[PDB]
Structure 1
Amino acid sequence: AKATTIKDAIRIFEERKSVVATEAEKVELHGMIPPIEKMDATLSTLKACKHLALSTNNIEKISSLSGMENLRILSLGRNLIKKIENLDAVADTLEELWISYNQIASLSGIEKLVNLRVLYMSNNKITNWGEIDKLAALDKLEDLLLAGNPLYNDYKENNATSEYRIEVVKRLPNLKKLDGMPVDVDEREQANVAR
């Protein structure tokens, strides 16, 4: 009753959905009872998995992403992940990363996700614009969500949400949607003149 192994999560998901984990495109090992604490190499059998969901667990480190050649969606929210790392195995096919609410304060390594299109990591421990500056290397990034971070809250409590969005668009000129709201041409012009 302390932690759930990946094999136990796979068996529970198979019992729930009546589908083999290795053949299921959407593998749902998230929200296990008890929450999963460690991520191991058993997940390498998910060759056909396009949506891996291990979110809402007690996983502290990201590892053993190899073996998932068709991995396009990775869900690791509501976990104890503090550092972005070990994403080289699935960086070729990953397009969306769901790591929101985590304790991540540094965005080092996110540049490995060259094919990332959606990045929702709101409510994290981001306190400086240097981490946002690291997102400029993502050419295919079109949607970003950062509500609830300390940096976002500093502007929100001071009623400077517009200024926060202007800074975000300035650092990411090609961003299409921010905090669930599409970036308008006026915001783009303000970011351009501020840049």
Structure 2
Amino acid sequence: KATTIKDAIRIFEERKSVVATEAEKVELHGMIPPIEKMDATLSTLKACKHLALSTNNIEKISSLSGMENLRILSLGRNLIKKIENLDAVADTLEELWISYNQIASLSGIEKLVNLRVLYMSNNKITNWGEIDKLAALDKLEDLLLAGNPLYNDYKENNATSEYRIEVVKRLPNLKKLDGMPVDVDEREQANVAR
């Protein structure tokens, strides 16, 4: 019943009139019935730079081998709980878009050594120890955490400004946070405290 990767690719090729093995952006989002599993058919997407698997029912990241040029992995609005099984794309992946999932731990994110952009609004991160795990990512410049419990804690206390300083204290070279540039004043506040 669930849409398979093979079937979603066929739907995409018919909608976009392209050969999916040659496409840079492969649009597999919002299938009806939803996709539930990533699988080995993804290995056929040899040209893919942006894989859009958002708005499905995927529970597990898997099956990313064979996409040698993948830059953007888009998995927002699924049922994912864990960052894992990304080794096959770590050498090229620059952006992980995974907002509106159920991720409570950032363990595993450290394998994405080339990551520049992490969009993960509306997940289940509750505490600063998870954010500390992002400090290893030397190229991370754009981060979205809005809607996670940790973010909401500060918003509930009208202290989002304080939350932003705490992020930049941990991530000193971050350039953009929750869609808003890190202001020089925020960087200096984080510095004079760090």
For the aligned pair, the TM-score class normalised by the smaller chain equals over 0.9
Cα offset, 1:59, TM superposition: 0.5
Aligned to 2:13: 14
How far is the alpha carbon of 1:172 from its aligned partner?
Answer: 0.2
- TM superposition shift of 1:185: 1.0
Say how many residue pairs are matched. Answer: 194
In structure 2, what is the Cα distance between the partners aligned to 1:16 and 1:191?
Answer: 49
1:80 is paired with a residue whose SS is: coil
How far apart in 1 are the matches of 2:28 and 2:70? 14
Work out the CA distance in 2 between the residues paired with 1:133 and 1:193. 19
In the TM superposition, what is the alpha-carbon distance from 1:141 to its structure 2 partner?
0.3
Measure how far apart 1:19 and its partner are: 0.2
Deviations for 1:83-129, whole angstroms, at most 9, x for unmatched residues?
Answer: 00001100000000011111000000100000000000111100010
Distance 2:28 2:161 in 1: 38
Q: TM-score, structure 2 length as denominator?
A: 0.99
Q: CA deviation at 1:157?
A: 1.2
Matched residue of 1:52: which SS? Answer: strand
| Cα distance in 2 for residues equivalent to 1:20 and 1:84 | 30
Percent sequence identity over aligned pairs: 100
- 1:139 and 1:166 map into 2 onto residues whose CA distance is 19
Deviation of 1:176 after TM superposition, in Å, equals 0.3
Q: Deviations over 1:121-176 (max 9, x none)?
A: 11110001001000000000000011001111111011001000000000000000
Residues 40-79 of structure 1 deviation map (CA, whole Å, 9 limit, x = unaligned): 1100010100111011100000111000001111100101
Aligned-residue offset at 1:194: 1.9
Aligned to 2:31: 32
Match of 1:67 in 2: 66
| Alignment root-mean-square deviation, CA | 0.6
Q: Distance in 2 between matches of 1:15 and 1:132?
A: 42
Aligned to 1:181: 180
Residue 89 of structure 1 aligns to a residue in which SS?
A: helix
Q: What is the CA–CA distance in structure 2 between the aligned matches of 1:186 and 1:23, rounded to whole Å?
A: 46
CA distance in 1: counterparts of 2:126 and 2:175, whole angstroms = 23
SS state at 1:74 partner? strand
The 1-side partners of 2:168 and 2:122 are apart by 19
SS at structure 1 position matched to 2:58: coil
Gaps in structure 2 of 5+ consecutive residues = none
Mapping for residues 155-174 of structure 1, pairs under 5 Å: 155-174=154-173
Match of 1:135 in 2: 134
How far apart are residue 17 of structure 1 and its match? 0.1
Provide the secondary structure at the position in 2 that maps to 1:16.
helix
Structure 1: gaps of 5 or more residues: none
Cα shift at 1:3: 0.8
CA distance in 2 between counterparts of 1:159 and 1:177 reads: 20
The Cα shift of 1:193 comes to 1.8
| Structure 1 runs (4+) greater than 4 angstroms displaced | none
Alpha-carbon distance, 1:192 to partner: 1.1
